[PDB]
Amino acid sequence: PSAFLEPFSASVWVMMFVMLLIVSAIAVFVFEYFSPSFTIGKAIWLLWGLVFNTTSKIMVSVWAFFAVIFLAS
């Protein structure tokens, strides 16, 4: 079968695929919005570093709950 797709996991694959994209976009937007540098160069890096083992970092840290919930699901 295919890899990293519906046959491998997430038999529905109709809601989580866009959910992850929209939450990632929201996190990237709010990382720069709550800055007081590079959007895709730092926000995405922080997200991918928090999914696995200033105030912007603190507020992005809330997304670790979503990351662990997604991993458990």
Binding site: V14, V23, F34, F66
Partner: peptide, 29 residues
């Protein structure tokens, strides 16, 4: 899909919104 996916999506969205709102009001205050 059905009730479970919608419920978990709403729960995580509400948690994220509450966290970002708390951070925003803390920064503003």
């Amino acid at each position: 899909t059905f009730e479970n996916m919608a419920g978990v999506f709403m729960l995580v969205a509400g948690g994220i919104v509450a966290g970002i709102f708390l951070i925003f009001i803390e920064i503003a205050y």
